[PDB]
Amino acid sequence: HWGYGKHNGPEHWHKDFPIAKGERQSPVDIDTHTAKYDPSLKPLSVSYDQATSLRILNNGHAFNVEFDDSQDKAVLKGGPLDGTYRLIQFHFHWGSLDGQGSEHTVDKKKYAAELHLVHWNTKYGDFGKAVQQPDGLAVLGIFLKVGSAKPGLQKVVDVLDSIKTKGKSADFTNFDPRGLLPESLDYWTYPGSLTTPPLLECVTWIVLKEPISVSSEQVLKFRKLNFNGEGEPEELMVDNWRPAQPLKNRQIKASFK
Ligand SMILES: [N]S(=O)(=O)[C][C][C]C1234B567B89%10B5%11%12B85%13B98%14B%1061B821B326B%115(B%12724)C%13%1416
Ligand SMILES: [Zn+2]
Numbered sequence: 001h002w003g004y005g006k007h008n009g010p011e012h013w014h015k016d017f018p019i020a021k022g023e024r025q026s027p028v029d030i031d032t033h034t035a036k037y038d039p040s041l042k043p044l045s046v047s048y049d050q051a052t053s054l055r056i057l058n059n060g061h062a063f064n065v066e067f068d069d070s071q072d073k074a075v076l077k078g079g080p081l082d083g084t085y086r087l088i089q090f091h092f093h094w095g096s097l098d099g100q101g102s103e104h105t106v107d108k109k110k111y112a113a114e115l116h117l118v119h120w121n122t123k124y125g126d127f128g129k130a131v132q133q134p135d136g137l138a139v140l141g142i143f144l145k146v147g148s149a150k151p152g153l154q155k156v157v158d159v160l161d162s163i164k165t166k167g168k169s170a171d172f173t174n175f176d177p178r179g180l181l182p183e184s185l186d187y188w189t190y191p192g193s194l195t196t197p198p199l200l201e202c203v204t205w206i207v208l209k210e211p212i213s214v215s216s217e218q219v220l221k222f223r224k225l226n227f228n229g230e231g232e233p234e235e236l237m238v239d240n241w242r243p244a245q246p247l248k249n250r251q252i253k254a255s256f257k
Contacts, residue, residue, distance in 0.1 A: 002197050003061065003227065010242045017199045024201045025245035026192030027103035030252055035188055038253040044185040044206065045078035046140070046178075051087060053175035056159055060166035060227055061196060062091040062240055065156065065175060069120070069127075074177070076119045076138050079206055079255065080189045085119035085138040088127055090177060092116070093195075094222050096238035098146045101219075103195050103241045104207050106143075111211060112219055113144035114241070115180055116195075134191070136202040142182065143211035150214045152179015157221045166229040182210035186256040195242045209256065 002008050002016060014020035051074035057064045066089045067074055074087035094113035095101030102111035117140040120130040130136030155175055162170045186209040193201045225237035 004240050013197055013199065017197045019193070019199045019201060022193070022199070022201055023248050024191050024193055024250065025199065026195050026203060026205060027105075027242060027244055028190065028192065028247050028250075028252070029105045029108055029244040030188050030207065032107050035252040035254045037257050038255070041080055041189070041253060041255045042078040043255070044076070044140075044187060046076060046181065046185065048074050048087070048176070048178045050074060051177055053172050053177075055169050056156070056163055056172035057169040058163040058166055058225060058237075060229070062093065062237070063156075063160065063163060063225065064089045064091045065172060065177075072122065075122075076117075076140060076206075079187060080204060080253070081138055082135070084122045086122055087117060087119050087177070090115060090117045090180070092144070092222065093241040094144075094219060094238065095241065096223065096236075098216075098219070100239070101241055102143055103244075104141055104143075104205075105244055111143040112146050113214070113222070115142040115144065115212070116140070117142075117177065117180075131194070131198075131200045131202045133202055135204060137194075138204045138206060141205060141207040142180065143208070144214050144219070145211045146216050146219055147213040148215065149218060150180070150212050152176070153212075153214055153218055157218050160221050160225055164224070164230075165226045165232070168230070180212065182208055182212050184208070184210040186210065186254075188252050188254055190250050190252045192250075
């Protein structure tokens with residue numbers, strides 16, 4: 001099966017998923033000098049007041065915080081988007097050390113981790129139909145640097161001991177993802193893909209410029225998770241990031257001067 005190792009990591013994925021070498025793959029390096037300010041881009045509208053988290057899951061690649069997406073509650077709109085995108089889950093990518101972990105890079109700078117809030121376009125009715133469309137998903141990406149603790153992250157950190165291994169889940173209700181957002185919603189945007197198999201080219205990426213700070217202790221708890229299932233040899237869940245892919249025929253647009 002695909003994963004993040006020497007034998008099954010990103011440089012192997014193209015064998016089972018040939019779109020890995022496609023024209024709109026993610027992540028990418030954001031060259032800040034080349035990204036053009038687009039005065040036509042709108043402010044991002046992040047409406048998470050009514051978000052209903054259900055559960056947290058270790059899927060063997062990351063942990064997913066899942067939301068009830070059966071109504072228009074938690075939605076992303078505006079920015080570069082046409083229409084309404086519903087929050088379905090968030091997860092992170094992180095490193096074995098603070099100098100790597102992010103998927104997007106900024107002038108080749110790697111952050112310690114990257115948060116992905118995944119949303120689907122309600123015009124396609126369900127997530128499985130949305131991923132078959134070039135405008136099916138919007139993923140809001142947020143960089144993590146190590147410094148001060150993020151108080152709004154601690155409820156996630158504290159539940160990880162209960163989902164150490166692949167296939168473990170835990171009730172995770174009433175988690176407010178507003179506590180994971182930075183102050184500024186300034187962003188870069190470009191058309192891309194899922195960054196894990198099946199690598200579908202269905203994503204409008206919205207990457208916030210301002211990182212959030214998390215503590216060394218918070219990210220060290222991410223690194224205690226396991227890729228393996230219960231009663232299997234321990235492989236620490238670290239370095240679950242895909243490197244930057246070729247930009248090809250794409251423009252990265254900035255919301256800000
Ligand atoms: N890094 S990313 O592009 O947000 C994709 C995250 C991984 C996935 B795979 B497939 B299943 B499904 B799609 B993809 B996104 B979560 B579940 B799992 C959803
Ligand atoms: Zn992701």
